[PDB]
Design a protein around this ligand. Structure first.
Ligand SMILES: CCN1CNS(=O)(=O)c2cc(F)ccc21
Ligand SMILES: CCN1CNS(=O)(=O)c2cc(F)ccc21
Ligand SMILES: N[C@@H](CCC(=O)O)C(=O)O
Ligand SMILES: N[C@@H](CCC(=O)O)C(=O)O
Ligand SMILES: [Cl-]
Ligand SMILES: [Cl-]
Ligand SMILES: [Cl-]
Ligand SMILES: [Cl-]
Ligand SMILES: [Cl-]
Lengths: 260, 260
């Protein structure tokens, strides 16, 4: 018999955001954003009812090196706490080994956010100076990229970041943004081009994405490995992509009401 | 035993090496997909035989007979174990075959003779002096055929009825037509092949406007093939090691045939 599908997601603008009047709203109505709209479209095409739930620990997902335990949305899927993740969850090798991913619904690359006027144009620029600190989000794919990289410039960046004091890592994108904005150009933030380009369109329009992306990947809808939901959701993603609905949702949440 | 790889002669993905007539087996061929096949096979631990698709087509389903041709057909009817080629991930194909996560991104794009007065798909659709078309039996044609997006629908209505036929059998042939058409023929093809051609003599073509859509190529296996899982992880591993980027830079490497 049909059950309500438990969707794990994360409060990350503009994917999932609290609606203005959330304090008097319940269930899915509390939220708005790209992934809220996407969940609606996927559910419609797949014919299921669902319940959006914000991941408890507020993390994307990393495996503890000691205990081998997955946290974040990946953990929610791995341990059977959610049926599907509809979020800016990056497709990675280590994750692909433990959960299923649809074909990508959005492309991104790691990128550099600076306060306007910062004399940085590239990862190479960052790696060759010490005046401007830089870091990444915790418990996500960007941090793991640097930790695992065998590419010289990135390995050099990781060697710096891992030991920098105070810590250059942040717990949320918002914290990284604030750090860039408040540091008078002495902090640059390594984040996905999607979030970077979003922030670039928000007041007070004091940040910008600089240089090319450091890699190329995408977000996928994730399900527990072997989940029967996987096939249908994947086709739904390709259909929506082909129909141009994904391009429409991107423009809607990034650019249509940009503030800059 | 020996994995049979179906692929297609398409520069710079798979090309006959100089003096190939005295070569044998896999050594006859060079290119991005040739190198990729080697890398995938090494990671997955299989021996393989590259074979060029008999009918020289990517893959389309005959409306009447509902039979698949091209590489898609070779997978569907058991003639090959895997396709390693610039084979576009699409909804209709995903229904009948398995695809790895993408190893390369692309979008449908416009190729014009330099100086042609066109900067967008919209421009093309709003005029009639410049003819335009696509490859036969491929994802670009099916995209326009299936599209409910206004401008693309208009372009299709024109293309389907244009006489003489605006469709071509091969990329080389569409490119020739652009060059020999004094600018009265624009070619719709994938950004990857467009950008490759853009950097080669006689440097008289160019990619204009943004891409009309966003998708990628995937390594394809028959539905439910056990090779699928390993090949998918291999793609992600190569991507994260930056080996896919290295391959792209190598085969799209600009020796400065045009300017510089
Ligand atoms: C987000 C759009 N999109 C739809 N799914 S896809 O055809 O598997 C794909 C592959 C890519 F390499 C880049 C984008 C992309
Ligand atoms: C081609 C590189 N690449 C690696 N495989 S992926 O992480 O599934 C992916 C998703 C995208 F949306 C765009 C590119 C991309
Ligand atoms: N999308 C990333 C989080 C953001 C980042 O790591 O930059 C992930 O899935 O882990
Ligand atoms: N990559 C395309 C062929 C080229 C095109 O259609 O423009 C396909 O898989 O069908
Ligand atoms: Cl300031
Ligand atoms: Cl071999
Ligand atoms: Cl439209
Ligand atoms: Cl008709
Ligand atoms: Cl011209």
């Amino acid at each position: 018999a049909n059950k309500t599908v438990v969707v794990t997601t994360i409060l990350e603008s503009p994917y999932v955001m609290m609606k203005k009047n959330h304090e008097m709203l319940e269930g899915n109505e509390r939220y708005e954003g790209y992934c809220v709209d996407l969940a609606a479209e996927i559910a419609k095409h797949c014919g299921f009812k669902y319940k959006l739930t914000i991941v408890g620990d507020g993390k994307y997902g990393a495996r503890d090196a000691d205990t081998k335990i997955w946290n974040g949305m990946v953990g929610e899927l791995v341990y059977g706490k959610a049926d599907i993740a509809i979020a800016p969850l990056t497709i990675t090798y280590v994750r692909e080994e433990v959960i299923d991913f649809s074909k990508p619904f959005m492309s991104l690359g790691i990128s550099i956010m600076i306060k306007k006027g910062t004399p940085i144009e590239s990862a190479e620029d960052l790696s060759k100076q010490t005046e401007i600190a830089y870091g990444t989000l915790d418990s996500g794919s960007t941090k793991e990229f640097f930790r695992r990289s065998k590419i010289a410039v990135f390995d050099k960046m990781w060697t710096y970041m891992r030991s920098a004091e105070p810590s250059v890592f942040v717990r949320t994108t918002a914290e990284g943004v604030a750090r860039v904005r408040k540091s008078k150009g002495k902090y640059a933030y390594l984040l996905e081009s999607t979030m970077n380009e979003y922030i670039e369109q928000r007041k007070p329009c004091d940040t910008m994405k600089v240089g090319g992306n450091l890699d190329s990947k995408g977000y996928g809808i994730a399900t527990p490995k072997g989940s029967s939901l996987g096939n249908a959701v994947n086709l739904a993603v390709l259909k929506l992509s082909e129909q141009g609905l994904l391009d429409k949702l991107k423009n809607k949440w990034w650019y249509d009401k940009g503030e800059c």
